[PDB]
Structures are given as C-alpha cells and as structure tokens.
Design a protein around this ligand. Structure first.
Ligand code: LGV
Length: 297
C-alpha cells in the first residue's frame, strides 16, 4: 500500500465505544483531529482489521477503502483518512450514529410487548429517504460508477436521520441471507438482465433502488419471502414483481414499478427519479444535494 495525502498520524485519532461489525473487523466511534479542515475534534467512525490478520489482508482492507477517496457528496458516507503506518490499521470515515438502513428500518417494527409504539414512517419521511438515496446514486453515476449492491443494508443513517450511500462491501457477512452463492450475488435486489447476463449498469442500480423503496415501505422485510434463492432468479427473469406492500401509498408503489420496468432503457434515471419528487424534499436539499449542485451538468 502506497502512503497518501489521506494518511493521518495515529496520535490524531481517539477510539471509544464499538459501533458494530464491518467486513474486515469491528467499526468504532471516536474523535479525530484535522480530518475535517482544521477541526480539532470531529466525531468519526473508525474501521479496523482483526489484529491476527496477514499483511496481505491489511493491504486489501486499505486498497478497498481507497475507492472512497474520489467521493465528496452529502448523500454518500465520507472517507476522512487512513492510518497505514504501523498497527492497528485504520480507516477514518464520517460517523453515521443510526447504523445501516436495514437495521434502522428493522428497529422501527413493533416489539410484541404491550407498550406504545411509533407509527410506521409517513409517506413524507419515506420520500425524503428515497430522495437522499437517489441523490447519492445520481452522484455516483455522474462520477461514472455502477454500485452493483444498492440495498438498505448498504445505506447508512445519520444522527439527524439523513440517509446516505454507505461504505462499500461491508454487509456480506452481516446479512448472509441477502446473498446467494449458486460468486456472491444479492439476488433479491438484482435486475432480470443482471441475473441473466451478469451485467450491471446505472439502470440495474435503478432496479435495486426500487427494491430499497419496497424495503422502506415494508420495514426491511425480505424481498420475495416464501421464494427460495433459485425461485427468485426464475420469478424475476420471467417478469415477476414484488407485491405492493400493505398500506404502501400508490404514489410510492408507482415509483417502484417505474424502477422495475423489464427493459433497463425504460427505467427512470436517478436524476429523473429526483426530479419527480424534488417538490417533496426538505428545503435544505436544494443547498446540499448533488442534484442542485454546479456538478450536476
Ligand atoms: O460500518 C458499517 N456497519 C457497522 C456499524 N457502523 C456504524 N456507523 C458507521 C460506520 C461508518 C463507516 C464504516 C466506517 N460510519 N458510521 C454503526 C452505528 C451503529 C451501529 N453501527 N454499525 C456499515 C454498514 C453498511 C454500510 F453500507 N457501510 C458501513
């Protein structure tokens, strides 16, 4: 691994409580100095590798993390720095206190005790999440990337409830059942063309986005529940679709349906998705989004 402008002296990092498991190891919260301009103390997340990992693994952890270096969008989790000189190997990133979107959605399901409970997210809360996710995705596409694993588990929730495209390749061992080996495919999120030809584009990311909306509307139920992984492949490739979740506003299901057009060319783009809901976005969206930025053509 070649040390970069992203290197941060170990002494500038403080690690406290653990947050949750990542791909190469436990993710911690803590504080960092000089990673967000000249801020002496910024709350950050700290990715680690298990100490008993080889030199090869540590380098692989660092190389994977480096793909994030090119991005700077309000609706994509930011990489802040890297600790590669000596051990433990660290990656410093924007702190998302509310965890992955799949865990956050699952935490909103009623508990089964006799106590009071928050009603499920309103349509406006669901649209705000849809817009922020679509904005991060429109940003990635403008930067010539195909995500290939867009799903609620790969989105993160901030303290203020802002949803962002999360850190890349972190949930394959957290949500094992969301992946199918017979490499590892997230079949319940895949477009018919990706299942048939193994090809992924922004239009297949759009398909997966529709699945993310269905996850939001069901509080992260498993898509195509009652179908096995092989049955999912067959059902989707034959033009089968997910049912409208009970109580899902038709407006929201219609957007899912546009995302699930069998032909990828007939699917809306992420910019097209945002445009259709922009009037419903909180006013700050016009100030922070890629959509309203100078970068959006
Ligand atoms: O890291 C993931 N999950 C573990 C986790 N992380 C939390 N917060 C956090 C991690 C990060 C960046 C990786 C450094 N920022 N904020 C957190 C807060 C509460 C419980 N958890 N559990 C993860 C998951 C999906 C996805 F797409 N990307 C990353």
């Amino acid at each position: 691994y070649v040390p970069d402008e992203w290197e941060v002296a170990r002494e500038k990092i403080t690690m406290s409580r653990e947050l949750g498991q990542g791909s190469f190891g436990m993710v911690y919260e803590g504080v960092a100095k000089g990673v967000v301009k000249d801020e002496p103390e910024t709350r950050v997340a700290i990715k680690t590798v298990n100490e008993a990992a080889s030199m090869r693994e540590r380098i692989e952890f660092l190389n994977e993390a480096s793909v994030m270096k090119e991005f700077n969008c309000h609706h994509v989790v930011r990489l802040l720095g890297v600790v590669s000189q000596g051990q433990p190997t660290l990656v410093i990133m924007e702190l998302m206190t509310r965890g992955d979107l799949k865990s956050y959605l699952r935490s909103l399901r009623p508990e089964m005790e006799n106590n009071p409970v928050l009603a499920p997210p309103s349509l406006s809360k669901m649209i705000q999440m849809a817009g922020e996710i679509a904005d991060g995705m429109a940003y990635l596409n403008a930067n010539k990337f195909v995500h290939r694993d867009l799903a609620a588990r790969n989105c993160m929730v901030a303290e203020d409830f802002t949803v962002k495209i999360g850190d890349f390749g972190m949930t394959r061992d957290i949500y094992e059942t969301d992946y199918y080996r017979k490499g590892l495919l997230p079949v319940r999120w895949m477009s018919p063309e990706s299942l048939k030809d193994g090809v992924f584009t922004t239009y297949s990311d759009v398909w997966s986005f529709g699945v993310v909306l269905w996850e939001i509307a069901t509080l992260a139920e498993q898509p195509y529940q009652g179908l096995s992984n092989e049955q999912v492949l067959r059902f989707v490739m034959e033009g089968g679709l997910l049912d409208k979740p009970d109580n899902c506003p038709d407006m929201l299901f219609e957007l899912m349906r546009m995302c699930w057009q069998y032909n990828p060319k007939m699917r809306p783009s992420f910019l097209e998705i945002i445009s259709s809901i922009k009037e419903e976005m909180e006013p700050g969206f016009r100030e922070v989004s890629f959509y309203y930025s100078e970068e959006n053509k």
